[PDB]
Design a protein around this ligand. Structure first.
Ligand code: ZN
Ligand code: ZN
Lengths: 134, 138, 48, 98, 196, 125, 195, 192
């Protein structure tokens, strides 16, 4: 037992978790939902030889996100945590990777373009300066 | 069975704050990691640069097990985000933000290469004339 | 030149440094005149 | 060049700081004075000429050729000086237009 | 004013010199720090120490900025932190199933063996470049500063894109090696596609 | 035996080390007639399979239906042909071209790529 | 913004992968910089082309090229590339129609202009690197003739061939009945003709 | 350029030749000799072919179809089962020092058309290489009527003196690697 030792319990329990890439507006809505205890629901529907995963947004937070699964045979991921109680722990192994994609296509772009406006717009050169004397 | 028309739905929680910060620990598949052998491990900040600005040093099963170095994700998720999705006993999902992504790679054990005493000099003479014997004379 | 069945009389070169080493200064005088003669005839114009 | 590059260059990466060698041979108690300067918004008038009087006027590109002037315009920038001393005060910042 | 284009790799023949082939890459944020441009990745030719294995036309080296002498590219990779050949070759070969290329890279790995550690590899680059001094550790710091800032600045200037930079070197070796098998045609010196 | 037997004894560069992942080199055991491959920086050694460790100049890895990736067929500037019957699918529309390689070598022989999704199949003439 | 769009679309970052497990993918470059890899270049290339013609990506400042025999896609947004306007032909026909011509004649009192014409996405600016990949047709005539001709794959079309001429070679009449060095000699003398 | 016969990647023409000639250049851009032939060789194509062959500076690298290096200590159990007949063929070829030959094997494959054009024989090559490197380089070869042309090479030593007297004045050079140096030099040097 020591401060430099890592807790392996999670690893030894074979705990599996999912890793998902998501677009900024969704993370921004979750940052606006703060911690109310819901942001929406995740739905998984499997067939005879096909499995389909998706997320659907909360009506309130809005006031279908399909998931694409990615091979994990190329890299091995687990997760560790750095507690405020200074006690490091290995929580589990990453058993799945995925990417959250938008369902809207072109309209979206405008939001993005609006998003572009939000990221890109401090005043550059932009306005001469008429004529000063002092 | 129902398994061929099974529909499942879970709630998603995103707590505003957590006592512990959340990290990724990533390994190459090529590295053939085996967590069953990880009887013990240590996790300490690296010492080459001699805290929150330095790479990580991972020591498993101490000096006998494997030793790895951890480097911080150089890229930044400015247009994306990474989240962990976890199942909870109540029947819902919890999602946690990735505070950092660290890339872990094997250091070597007693491979041993001084490369300082006269190896630079021996290189001037090097005609691939020898290889085993110089490593041994240490 | 030293090889069998190669005519040791007419065998010649467009090179001049080598003609000097093997055949000696008079042969260079002839060969060098010939090589200059040869570039001039090609270009079609005649020089006296 | 005017709309992006010039503004980009002065905004970019030359913030500067300066600090005298106080507490020399002795000192103590508090402050080795330090000063920080940073450049921001940039301004560019219409082309102007200044008569010997000092009176500024609208220049015309033909007038520039017959008298041999130089058809150019004056450039001005927002500069800030930013007094965060080693303790007693962190704010005493001043806006200029230069 | 017409110039030859920036931050793009070209593989061209230079049969008149000791280099069999060269990869030139002029690197610059013509809208960034506006410093300089350099890196050459070169395939050697015409030579033989005697009974080394001989064959000089696989002995790939790299000219770096500020460095006074040519250094083998594998040494630069080992200075970036990678130590295992498979990983350098993974950075290099992608397809993994080209045994021909693997033997082509093989003498460079054979030359690497003396500096298999990062620190000494850095010190090697230091001695090849800096002024002679007993400041080994400082010399390593200087060497580190060159590879981070002065090599391929258009790839990055910070720790945070030091790994990414290693992928780009592998692309410069790959592109060079591709021209040397003849699987890819050479880049013409005077194609406007390569000018600004 | 026969001269028809292909020439691919296994060129083989990598099967590198299993421990430190560096390159293996041949080395002798005069005692058991066995080749071994050893990492130069560690004590690991293992026997080789084939006695072959190097070959040079197949002089004809004609490379006629390899490396030429099938996505080449989407290229609009390559000549589509009415010349029919891909040798796999019952559809024409082969895209064709010379050499495409600097060992051009001197080839004038055409290479044909079927362009419909049912093949991707390639073949020389 | 180009880097942003690709990152949200599908392009995997270089550190997200192990090369020996995904090296087969098409490579992506932005101003000579290797940003990542992609497993479907034809759709993405088609989409980027669709955006640039839709004005979501700055047309005059962005070139986009696919080199299919090396399975990589480089895009350039740098200054100093020479590019020219060309017509976009699709389905083996012009995308520009007579309705636009009557709209252009209308400008004597209409505010409709060349910029509107580019936004119709019937013309694109094509730089020399990209000009290496197009199948450019000399005239609409040839593009019609194609039913008997060898090529039926055109992508762009010349707005007119005499435009390959610079200012001084343009003052001179019937230049093609001139033996070619005569055209160079006039262009010089043209600067010396006083007026 | 003036197209003529087969040649004409020949003799620099004009002012560049005037500069080349008048400077007394040590390194002309295109040096040549016009060689004339005598006897039957002045009127027969095949005779001319024979003299040309003697003149043509061919090196073994130009001639070789292929090379391979094999690990085979004892021939009488060859790793290449098809080679097994030469072992039947070559058991009496210095039968004592099969106990001395190195277990590293070099194999060369030759093209029959290219070997024909030089009108060269396998015995002349074996004798040329043997004479150049010395008795140390132990060479044997195949039947000229085989459909595959092969040269089989091992390396021998001086027997008596090599018993690890001090540490073997070679500094333990790898023998495969030395065999590559033989292959490097054997091809690049041998002026058959
Ligand atoms: Zn090893
Ligand atoms: Zn087909």
């Amino acid at each position: 037992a020591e401060r430099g030792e890592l807790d392996l319990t999670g690893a030894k329990q074979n705990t599996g978790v999912w890793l998902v890439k998501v677009p900024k507006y969704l993370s921004q809505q979750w940052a606006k939902a703060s911690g109310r205890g819901e942001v929406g629901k995740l739905r998984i529907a499997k067939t005879q030889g096909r499995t389909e995963v998706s997320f659907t947004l909360n009506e309130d937070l809005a006031n279908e996100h399909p998931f694409v699964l990615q091979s994990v045979g190329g890299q091995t991921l687990t997760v560790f945590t750095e507690s405020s109680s200074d006690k490091l722990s290995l929580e589990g192994i990453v058993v799945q990777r995925a990417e959250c994609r938008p369902a809207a296509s072109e309209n979206y772009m405008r939001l993005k373009r609006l998003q572009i406006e939000e990221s890109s717009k401090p005043v550059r050169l932009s306005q001469q300066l008429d004529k000063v004397v002092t | 069975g129902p398994s061929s028309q099974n529909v499942t739905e879970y709630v998603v929680r995103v707590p505003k704050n957590t006592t512990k910060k959340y990290n990724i620990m990533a390994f190459n598949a090529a590295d053939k990691v085996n967590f069953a052998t990880w009887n013990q491990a240590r996790l300490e900040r690296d010492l080459s640069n001699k805290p929150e600005d330095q790479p990580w040093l991972l020591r498993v099963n101490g000096k006998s097990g494997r030793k790895f170095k951890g480097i911080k994700k150089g890229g930044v998720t400015e247009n994306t985000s990474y989240y962990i999705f976890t199942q909870c006993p109540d029947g819902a999902f919890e999602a946690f933000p990735v505070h950092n992504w660290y890339n872990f790679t094997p250091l070597a054990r007693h491979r041993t290469l001084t490369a300082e005493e006269a190896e630079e000099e021996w290189e001037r003479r090097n005609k691939v004339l020898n290889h085993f014997s110089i490593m041994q004379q240490r | 030149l030293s090889e069998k069945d190669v005519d040791p009389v007419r065998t010649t070169s467009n090179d001049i440094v080598e003609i000097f080493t093997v055949l000696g200064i008079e042969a260079v005088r002839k060969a060098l005149e010939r090589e200059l003669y040869h570039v001039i005839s090609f270009d079609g114009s005649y020089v006296n | 060049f005017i709309q992006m590059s010039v503004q980009r260059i002065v905004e970019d990466a030359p913030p500067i700081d300066l600090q005298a060698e106080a507490q020399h041979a002795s000192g103590e108690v508090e402050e080795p004075p330090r000063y920080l300067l940073k450049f921001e918004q940039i301004y560019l008038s219409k082309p102007t000429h200044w008569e010997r009087d000092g009176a500024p006027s609208p220049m015309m590109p033909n007038e520039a050729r017959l008298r041999n002037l130089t058809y150019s315009a004056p450039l001005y920038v927002d500069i800030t000086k930013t007094v965060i001393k080693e303790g007693e005060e962190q704010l005493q910042t001043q806006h200029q237009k230069t | 004013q017409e110039k030859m284009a920036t931050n793009t790799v070209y593989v061209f023949a230079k049969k008149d010199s000791k280099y069999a082939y060269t990869g030139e890459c002029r690197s610059c944020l013509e809208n960034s720090s506006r410093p300089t441009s350099t890196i050459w990745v070169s395939m050697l030719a015409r030579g033989g120490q005697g009974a080394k294995k001989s064959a000089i036309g696989q002995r790939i080296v790299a000219t770096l900025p500020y460095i006074k002498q040519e250094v083998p590219i594998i040494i630069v990779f080992r200075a970036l932190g990678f130590v295992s050949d498979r990983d350098i070759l993974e950075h290099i070969i992608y397809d993994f199933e080209d045994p021909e290329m693997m033997e082509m890279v093989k003498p460079s790995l054979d030359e690497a063996f003396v500096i298999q550690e990062q620190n000494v590899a850095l010190n090697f680059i230091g001695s090849r470049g800096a002024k002679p001094g007993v400041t080994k550790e400082k010399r390593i710091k200087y060497a580190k500063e060159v590879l981070q800032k002065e090599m391929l600045p258009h790839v990055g200037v910070s720790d945070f894109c030091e790994t990414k930079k290693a992928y780009f070197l592998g692309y410069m070796v790959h592109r060079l090696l591709l021209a040397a098998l003849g699987r890819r045609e050479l880049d013409d010196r005077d194609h406007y596609g390569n000018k600004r | 035996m026969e001269p028809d037997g292909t020439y691919e004894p296994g060129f083989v560069g990598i099967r590198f080390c299993q421990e430190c992942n560096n390159m293996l080199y041949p080395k002798e055991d005069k005692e058991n007639r066995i080749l071994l491959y050893a990492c130069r920086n560690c004590d690991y050694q293992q026997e080789a399979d084939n006695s072959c460790i190097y070959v040079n100049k197949i002089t004809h890895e004609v490379d006629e239906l390899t490396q030429i990736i099938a996505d080449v067929s989407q290229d609009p500037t390559l000549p589509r042909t009415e010349d029919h019957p891909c040798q796999k699918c019952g559809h024409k529309e082969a895209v064709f071209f010379q050499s495409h390689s600097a060992r051009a070598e001197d080839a004038m022989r055409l290479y044909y790529v079927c362009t419909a999704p049912h093949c991707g199949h390639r073949w020389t003439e | 913004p180009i880097l942003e769009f690709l990152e949200e679309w599908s392009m995997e970052n270089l550190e997200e992968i192990s090369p020996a497990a995904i090296a087969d993918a098409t490579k992506i470059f932005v101003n000579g910089c290797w940003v990542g890899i992609h497993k479907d270049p034809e759709q993405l290339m088609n989409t980027l082309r669709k955006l640039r013609r839709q004005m979501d990506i700055i047309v005059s400042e962005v070139s986009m090229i696919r080199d299919i025999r090396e399975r990589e896609i480089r895009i350039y947004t740098d200054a100093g590339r020479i590019c020219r306007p060309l017509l976009i032909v699709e389905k083996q026909k012009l995308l520009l129609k007579k309705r636009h011509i009557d709209q252009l004649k209308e400008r004597e009192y209409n505010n409709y202009s060349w910029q509107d014409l580019v936004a119709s996405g019937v013309v694109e600016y094509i730089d020399t690197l990209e000009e290496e990949t197009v199948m450019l047709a000399m005239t609409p005539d040839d593009l019609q003739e194609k039913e008997v001709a060898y090529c039926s794959t055109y992508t762009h079309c010349e707005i007119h061939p005499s435009m390959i001429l610079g200012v001084c070679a343009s003052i001179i009449p019937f230049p093609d009945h001139n033996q070619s060095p005569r055209n160079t000699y006039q262009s010089a003398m043209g600067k010396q003709a006083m007026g | 350029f003036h197209y003529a016969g087969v040649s004409a990647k020949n003799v620099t023409l004009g002012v560049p030749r005037l500069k080349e000639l008048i400077n007394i250049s040590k390194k002309p851009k295109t040096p040549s000799l016009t060689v004339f032939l005598l006897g039957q060789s002045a009127r027969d194509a095949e005779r001319a072919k024979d003299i040309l062959c003697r003149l043509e500076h061919t090196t073994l690298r130009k001639v070789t179809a292929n090379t391979a290096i094999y690990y085979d200590p004892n021939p009488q159990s060859t790793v290449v089962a098809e080679d097994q007949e030469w072992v039947n063929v070559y058991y009496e070829m210095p039968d004592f020092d099969v106990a001395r030959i190195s277990p590293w094997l070099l194999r060369v494959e030759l093209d029959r058309k290219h070997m024909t054009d030089r009108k060269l024989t396998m015995e002349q090559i074996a004798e040329k290489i043997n004479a150049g490197f010395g008795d140390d380089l132990n060479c044997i070869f195949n039947d000229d009527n085989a459909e595959k042309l092969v040269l089989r090479i091992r390396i021998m030593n001086s027997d008596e003196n090599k018993m690890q007297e001090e540490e073997e004045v070679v500094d333990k050079m790898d023998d495969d690697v030395f065999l590559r140096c033989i292959e490097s030099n054997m091809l690049t040097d041998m002026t058959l």
